[PDB]
Design a protein around this motif. Sequence first.
Motif, PDB file in Angstrom:
ATOM      1  N   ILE A 155       0.857  -1.189   0.000  1.00  0.00           N
ATOM      2  CA  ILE A 155       0.000   0.000   0.000  1.00  0.00           C
ATOM      3  C   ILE A 155       0.893   1.238   0.000  1.00  0.00           C
ATOM      4  CG2 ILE A 155      -0.216  -0.049   2.564  1.00  0.00           C
ATOM      5  CD1 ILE A 155      -3.199   1.052   2.007  1.00  0.00           C
ATOM      6  N   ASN A 156       0.438   2.351  -0.589  1.00  0.00           N
ATOM      7  CA  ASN A 156       1.255   3.569  -0.673  1.00  0.00           C
ATOM      8  C   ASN A 156       1.541   4.190   0.701  1.00  0.00           C
ATOM      9  OD1 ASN A 156       2.688   5.668  -2.036  1.00  0.00           O
ATOM     10  ND2 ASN A 156       0.857   6.843  -2.450  1.00  0.00           N
ATOM     11  N   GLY A 157       2.769   4.698   0.871  1.00  0.00           N
ATOM     12  CA  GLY A 157       3.235   5.365   2.083  1.00  0.00           C
ATOM     13  C   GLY A 157       2.422   6.577   2.518  1.00  0.00           C
ATOM     14  N   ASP A 158       1.604   7.178   1.617  1.00  0.00           N
ATOM     15  CA  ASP A 158       0.736   8.292   2.002  1.00  0.00           C
ATOM     16  C   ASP A 158      -0.620   7.812   2.566  1.00  0.00           C
ATOM     17  OD1 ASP A 158      -0.751   7.756  -0.394  1.00  0.00           O
ATOM     18  OD2 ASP A 158      -0.600   9.800  -1.186  1.00  0.00           O
ATOM     19  N   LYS A 159      -0.790   6.493   2.857  1.00  0.00           N
ATOM     20  CA  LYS A 159      -2.022   5.920   3.405  1.00  0.00           C
ATOM     21  C   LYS A 159      -1.774   5.355   4.811  1.00  0.00           C
ATOM     22  CE  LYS A 159      -4.076   6.337  -0.645  1.00  0.00           C
ATOM     23  NZ  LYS A 159      -2.993   6.579  -1.624  1.00  0.00           N
ATOM     24  N   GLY A 160      -2.847   4.914   5.462  1.00  0.00           N
ATOM     25  CA  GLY A 160      -2.812   4.385   6.820  1.00  0.00           C
ATOM     26  C   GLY A 160      -2.344   2.958   6.933  1.00  0.00           C
ATOM     27  N   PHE A 211      -2.712  -2.623  -2.880  1.00  0.00           N
ATOM     28  CA  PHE A 211      -3.648  -1.505  -2.687  1.00  0.00           C
ATOM     29  C   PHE A 211      -3.240  -0.320  -3.537  1.00  0.00           C
ATOM     30  CE2 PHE A 211      -6.373  -2.189   1.189  1.00  0.00           C
ATOM     31  CZ  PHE A 211      -5.950  -3.465   1.476  1.00  0.00           C
ATOM     32  N   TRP A 212      -4.102   0.059  -4.454  1.00  0.00           N
ATOM     33  CA  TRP A 212      -3.876   1.225  -5.297  1.00  0.00           C
ATOM     34  C   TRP A 212      -5.253   1.689  -5.845  1.00  0.00           C
ATOM     35  CZ3 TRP A 212       0.449   4.095  -5.381  1.00  0.00           C
ATOM     36  CH2 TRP A 212       0.307   5.271  -6.131  1.00  0.00           C
ATOM     37  N   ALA A 213      -5.382   2.933  -6.328  1.00  0.00           N
ATOM     38  CA  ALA A 213      -6.639   3.387  -6.949  1.00  0.00           C
ATOM     39  C   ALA A 213      -7.015   2.428  -8.107  1.00  0.00           C
ATOM     40  CB  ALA A 213      -6.495   4.807  -7.468  1.00  0.00           C
ATOM     41  N   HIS A 214      -8.305   2.201  -8.327  1.00  0.00           N
ATOM     42  CA  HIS A 214      -8.802   1.268  -9.359  1.00  0.00           C
ATOM     43  C   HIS A 214      -8.323   1.500 -10.820  1.00  0.00           C
ATOM     44  CE1 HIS A 214     -11.330   4.652 -10.082  1.00  0.00           C
ATOM     45  NE2 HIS A 214     -11.723   4.103 -11.231  1.00  0.00           N
ATOM     46  N   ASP A 215      -7.810   2.691 -11.174  1.00  0.00           N
ATOM     47  CA  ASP A 215      -7.394   2.979 -12.554  1.00  0.00           C
ATOM     48  C   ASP A 215      -6.242   2.105 -13.069  1.00  0.00           C
ATOM     49  OD1 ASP A 215      -5.690   5.003 -10.851  1.00  0.00           O
ATOM     50  OD2 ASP A 215      -4.713   4.926 -12.822  1.00  0.00           O
ATOM     51  N   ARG A 216      -5.284   1.761 -12.186  1.00  0.00           N
ATOM     52  CA  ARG A 216      -4.120   0.933 -12.532  1.00  0.00           C
ATOM     53  C   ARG A 216      -4.440  -0.567 -12.656  1.00  0.00           C
ATOM     54  NH1 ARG A 216       0.765   3.309 -14.488  1.00  0.00           N
ATOM     55  NH2 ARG A 216       1.390   5.051 -13.137  1.00  0.00           N
ATOM     56  N   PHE A 217      -5.624  -1.003 -12.196  1.00  0.00           N
ATOM     57  CA  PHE A 217      -5.981  -2.420 -12.129  1.00  0.00           C
ATOM     58  C   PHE A 217      -6.424  -3.038 -13.460  1.00  0.00           C
ATOM     59  CE2 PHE A 217      -6.063  -3.517  -7.450  1.00  0.00           C
ATOM     60  CZ  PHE A 217      -5.480  -2.348  -7.038  1.00  0.00           C
ATOM     61  N   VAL A 237     -13.672   5.964  -1.755  1.00  0.00           N
ATOM     62  CA  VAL A 237     -13.662   6.957  -2.829  1.00  0.00           C
ATOM     63  C   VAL A 237     -12.786   8.161  -2.415  1.00  0.00           C
ATOM     64  CG1 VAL A 237     -15.059   8.321  -4.435  1.00  0.00           C
ATOM     65  CG2 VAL A 237     -15.951   6.166  -3.508  1.00  0.00           C
ATOM     66  N   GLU A 238     -11.853   8.525  -3.304  1.00  0.00           N
ATOM     67  CA  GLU A 238     -10.882   9.589  -3.100  1.00  0.00           C
ATOM     68  C   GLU A 238     -11.105  10.690  -4.106  1.00  0.00           C
ATOM     69  OE1 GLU A 238      -7.220   7.431  -3.871  1.00  0.00           O
ATOM     70  OE2 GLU A 238      -7.183   6.619  -1.822  1.00  0.00           O
ATOM     71  N   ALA A 239     -10.862  11.926  -3.690  1.00  0.00           N
ATOM     72  CA  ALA A 239     -10.976  13.083  -4.562  1.00  0.00           C
ATOM     73  C   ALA A 239     -10.254  14.263  -3.927  1.00  0.00           C
ATOM     74  CB  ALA A 239     -12.435  13.428  -4.807  1.00  0.00           C
ATOM     75  N   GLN A 244       4.742  17.736  -9.681  1.00  0.00           N
ATOM     76  CA  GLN A 244       5.441  16.631 -10.354  1.00  0.00           C
ATOM     77  C   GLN A 244       4.449  15.550 -10.793  1.00  0.00           C
ATOM     78  OE1 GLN A 244       9.009  17.746 -10.608  1.00  0.00           O
ATOM     79  NE2 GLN A 244       7.521  19.232  -9.843  1.00  0.00           N
ATOM     80  N   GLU A 245       3.573  15.121  -9.873  1.00  0.00           N
ATOM     81  CA  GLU A 245       2.552  14.115 -10.155  1.00  0.00           C
ATOM     82  C   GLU A 245       1.368  14.771 -10.903  1.00  0.00           C
ATOM     83  OE1 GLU A 245       2.691  10.897 -10.077  1.00  0.00           O
ATOM     84  OE2 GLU A 245       3.722  10.143  -8.284  1.00  0.00           O
ATOM     85  N   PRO A 246       0.992  14.281 -12.113  1.00  0.00           N
ATOM     86  CA  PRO A 246      -0.087  14.932 -12.888  1.00  0.00           C
ATOM     87  C   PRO A 246      -1.514  14.837 -12.337  1.00  0.00           C
ATOM     88  CG  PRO A 246       0.549  12.923 -13.942  1.00  0.00           C
ATOM     89  CD  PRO A 246       1.572  13.163 -12.879  1.00  0.00           C
ATOM     90  N   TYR A 247      -1.750  13.984 -11.341  1.00  0.00           N
ATOM     91  CA  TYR A 247      -3.039  13.821 -10.667  1.00  0.00           C
ATOM     92  C   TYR A 247      -3.497  15.112  -9.999  1.00  0.00           C
ATOM     93  CZ  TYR A 247      -6.075  11.710  -6.909  1.00  0.00           C
ATOM     94  OH  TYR A 247      -7.092  11.340  -6.056  1.00  0.00           O
ATOM     95  N   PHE A 248      -2.541  15.914  -9.505  1.00  0.00           N
ATOM     96  CA  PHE A 248      -2.814  17.162  -8.796  1.00  0.00           C
ATOM     97  C   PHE A 248      -2.992  18.377  -9.723  1.00  0.00           C
ATOM     98  CE2 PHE A 248      -1.804  15.661  -4.425  1.00  0.00           C
ATOM     99  CZ  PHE A 248      -1.028  14.555  -4.668  1.00  0.00           C
TER     100      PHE A 248
HETATM  101  O1  LIG Z   1      -0.089  11.304 -10.561  1.00  0.00           O
HETATM  102  C1  LIG Z   1      -0.591  10.357 -11.433  1.00  0.00           C
HETATM  103  C2  LIG Z   1      -1.100   9.168 -10.570  1.00  0.00           C
HETATM  104  O2  LIG Z   1      -2.331   9.644 -10.046  1.00  0.00           O
HETATM  105  C3  LIG Z   1      -3.139   8.769  -9.324  1.00  0.00           C
HETATM  106  O3  LIG Z   1      -2.411   8.358  -8.181  1.00  0.00           O
HETATM  107  C4  LIG Z   1      -2.767   8.951  -6.970  1.00  0.00           C
HETATM  108  C5  LIG Z   1      -3.448   7.863  -6.108  1.00  0.00           C
HETATM  109  O4  LIG Z   1      -4.595   7.484  -6.823  1.00  0.00           O
HETATM  110  C6  LIG Z   1      -3.798   8.532  -4.748  1.00  0.00           C
HETATM  111  O5  LIG Z   1      -4.437   7.572  -3.969  1.00  0.00           O
HETATM  112  C7  LIG Z   1      -2.512   9.104  -4.093  1.00  0.00           C
HETATM  113  O6  LIG Z   1      -1.770   8.042  -3.622  1.00  0.00           O
HETATM  114  O7  LIG Z   1      -1.754   9.860  -4.987  1.00  0.00           O
HETATM  115  C8  LIG Z   1      -1.452   9.323  -6.268  1.00  0.00           C
HETATM  116  C9  LIG Z   1      -0.744  10.512  -6.971  1.00  0.00           C
HETATM  117  O8  LIG Z   1       0.368  10.816  -6.153  1.00  0.00           O
HETATM  118  C10 LIG Z   1      -3.489   7.516 -10.165  1.00  0.00           C
HETATM  119  O9  LIG Z   1      -4.138   6.565  -9.389  1.00  0.00           O
HETATM  120  C11 LIG Z   1      -2.186   6.857 -10.740  1.00  0.00           C
HETATM  121  O10 LIG Z   1      -2.509   5.993 -11.773  1.00  0.00           O
HETATM  122  C12 LIG Z   1      -1.339   7.921 -11.476  1.00  0.00           C
HETATM  123  O11 LIG Z   1      -0.068   7.391 -11.739  1.00  0.00           O
END
Ligand SMILES: OC[C@H]1O[C@H](O[C@H]2[C@H](O)[C@@H](O)[C@@H](O)O[C@@H]2CO)[C@H](O)[C@@H](O)[C@@H]1O
Length: 461
Positions: free
Chosen positions: A125-130, A175-181, A224-226, A266-270
């Motif tokens: 699971i990502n280090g920015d989570k619990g 554990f990751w957001a559903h988009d990568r799955f 759900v995250e936003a 740096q991360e395009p999600y933001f």
């Molecule tokens: O930055 C592109 C990245 O965005 C999303 O990742 C988010 C993740 O979903 C959040 O839960 C949190 O951990 O931050 C990530 C961005 O730092 C997409 O899920 C991922 O595919 C994409 O690479």
Amino acid sequence: QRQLVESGGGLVQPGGSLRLSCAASGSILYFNRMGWYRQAPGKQRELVAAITSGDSTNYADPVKGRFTISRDNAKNTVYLQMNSLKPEDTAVYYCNAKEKGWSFSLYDYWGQGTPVTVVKLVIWINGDKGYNGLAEVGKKFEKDTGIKVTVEHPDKLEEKFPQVAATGDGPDIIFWAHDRFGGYAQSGLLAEITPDKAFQDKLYPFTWDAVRYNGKLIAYPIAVEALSLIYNKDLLPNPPKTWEEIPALDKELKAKGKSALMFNLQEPYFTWPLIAADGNAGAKAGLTFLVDLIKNKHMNADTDYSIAEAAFNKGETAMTINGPWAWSNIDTSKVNYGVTVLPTFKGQPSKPFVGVLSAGINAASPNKELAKEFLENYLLTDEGLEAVNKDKPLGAVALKSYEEELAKDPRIAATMENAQKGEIMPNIPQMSAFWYAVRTAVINAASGRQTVDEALKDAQT
Ligand SMILES: OC[C@H]1O[C@H](O[C@H]2[C@H](O)[C@@H](O)[C@@H](O)O[C@@H]2CO)[C@H](O)[C@@H](O)[C@@H]1O
């Protein structure tokens, strides 16, 4: 007749210990050799150790240094003390005794067999989570079952998981957001989820759709995250409703030694919400404004997650853009913060991308039914999601029972306000290449290499 009876076979955690014992119905003085052999599912007989009547012990290179073969001629028992155990040791262990009769010929004797299982439930699971909260759920799992639950948070796990899980062992659950799955599902790196109706009914039917690829459930939806606009009420009581009034606010704030907005560029999600606010013309319009902020020295070029979080938490910037998970670290700092709607750009609202945190079982894992148990009966529960949420907030959890507690939070209301203005990410396998194309395009335009018109040209290819 002589008969060998093994004992001491059970489940243990890698690093733990087990003492196998093999008692005979005769004197061990008559046996020439005694020893232990192991057989894992679908593999040949492998000798681990042996002891001759002349007291000389020999072992195999894998177990050498870790296992010791002992013998007690009083108890008519040969022993195998297994220490510092690993998953590779797992197998059915058998005892063996060789006897030279009065004449030239010999007699090999064998036993029932004793099963030894060295199991570990490893989670990524990502280090920015619990993860500390997810470990507390894991510690309650080991109390009720006996299986160790280690939680890991490696860097770039979204792109380290498909390389490691394909070739190596990797994690049991990811554990990751559903988009990568969708990319993991196409590649064949995820086991199909088969949850009973009673469990399926506990979560919202819209969350189950996000974790569905080609009519097959590929993960368990958690929350759900936003992204939302986090702002310091003390430095800024009436924060901006629009992006176009930030430069003015930054000129006002820089005079007092403070920034207006710092967030991960740096991360395009933001950056994507501002980019997809109007829409193409909407991406060109959105990215040119972001470039103008850096060109006007309002935002730093290499603004990452760490220097933006630290700046907001220290009280150096008035605002920041982050998700549910980020609130726990602000609560820890002495900042009176507020979560609100993302600013509008060109009248229309900034459309963030809505993620669904989901737990998928690795296709190359022998602990599939043990992980299902953990995910269903322990994590996706009122008590399990609470332990994670108090460490680092999950966001609008998928669990139906939490609806009232989520509706009591002012910040989850701002998260759902932004989620409705945004849209859920398609899970498709091309998301990886897309996210890379936007990541590079934003960094090139931010640093000052490629033009905004040439960035969308290379990204559309
Ligand atoms: O930055 C592109 C990245 O965005 C999303 O990742 C988010 C993740 O979903 C959040 O839960 C949190 O951990 O931050 C990530 C961005 O730092 C997409 O899920 C991922 O595919 C994409 O690479």
